């Protein structure tokens, strides 16, 4: 659902993500037995910055300033697909024929009678925690120092779970529970 990206290696330690590689070799081979195709699944890795409020293991809702250009990291659309295309195409075919069958006669007598990268603009915009966040966009993210939620040590500048210390526990924080809690 447009939320995963495939990681080649761990970029933080400069060392192979093992699980991914084994996925890809097994994926290539599929001429022989098509269900080898499913091993592409294991290479998917999700990408998001996820704050963790204390050691409670709950996700705070808070936001971070991101100096970037919005258009760049607009959340990719819902596609048209083939179904949407048929409807839209056939609508155009109708109109197009009709048009010219009337326009030609009417007109005569009418009168007579880039930067792959655009940085992220210096403009700030707030990005919610635990949303789909591109690798490039993650760089600009900086935790708000006024705000209660600050990482124990400075932000990686990359997607992944980063644990925050909460200055005030007194002040209720809006929370999104983990899934295990929902089922009970």
């Amino acid at each position: 659902g447009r939320n995963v990206t495939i990681q080649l290696e761990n970029a933080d330690t400069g060392t192979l993500d093992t699980k991914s590689v084994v996925g890809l070799v097994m994926f290539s081979q599929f001429w022989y037995w098509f269900p080898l195709a499913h091993f592409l699944s294991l290479s998917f890795t999700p990408t998001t910055v996820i704050g963790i409020r204390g050691s409670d293991q709950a996700i705070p809702k808070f936001q971070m300033n991101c100096y970037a250009k919005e258009d760049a990291f607009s959340y990719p659309r819902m596609y048209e697909e083939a179904s949407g295309k048929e409807v839209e195409k056939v609508a155009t075919a109708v109109l197009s024929t009709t048009a010219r069958a009337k326009a030609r006669a009417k007109k005569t007598k009418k009168e007579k009678g880039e930067f792959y990268k655009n940085k992220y603009s210096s403009k700030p915009y707030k990005v919610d925690n635990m949303t789909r966040i591109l690798p490039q966009q993650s760089r600009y993210i900086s935790f708000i120092k006024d705000d209660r939620f600050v990482p124990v040590r400075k932000f990686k500048g990359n997607n992944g779970v980063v644990v925050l210390r909460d200055r005030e526990p007194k002040e209720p924080v809006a929370l999104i529970e983990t899934v295990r809690q929902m089922k009970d």
Partner: protein, 118 residues
């Protein structure tokens, strides 16, 4: 690895120790993860750290992410019906592979239920 966690036994703030735990699991090999948890158990290290290094926290966290933020096309359902035939072995497979990747990491049964004849 063990020695690092002996340093933070003394410098034990659970916010700091946990953070370092997340970084480690993303990076390191499963084989390492196994050997480390046995050793730390006998260290009698903090059982908070032990939980992360199992990898179960991270799993839940990513499931909530995928539920909330999935964006699905309705056009896959219809495309599958129209062009492709779920009887033919090649054609039936391609759809399963594309759909499987689509709804990944989250239970989804909308597709199953709708393309139930297919």
């Amino acid at each position: 690895a063990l020695q690092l966690f002996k340093k933070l036994k003394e410098e034990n703030d659970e916010g700091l120790s946990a953070q370092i735990a997340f970084d480690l699991v993303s990076s390191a090999s499963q084989q390492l993860l196994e050997i480390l948890v046995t050793e730390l158990t006998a260290q009698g290290y903090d059982p908070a750290l032990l939980n992360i290094l199992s990898g179960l926290p991270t799993c839940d966290y990513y499931n909530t992410f995928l539920l909330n933020n999935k964006n699905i096309d309705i056009g896959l359902l219809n495309k599958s019906k129209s062009s492709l035939d779920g009887k033919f072995s090649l054609f039936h497979t391609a759809v399963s592979v594309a759909n499987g990747f689509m709804h990944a990491g989250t239970t989804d049964n909308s597709f199953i239920k709708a393309n139930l004849p297919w």
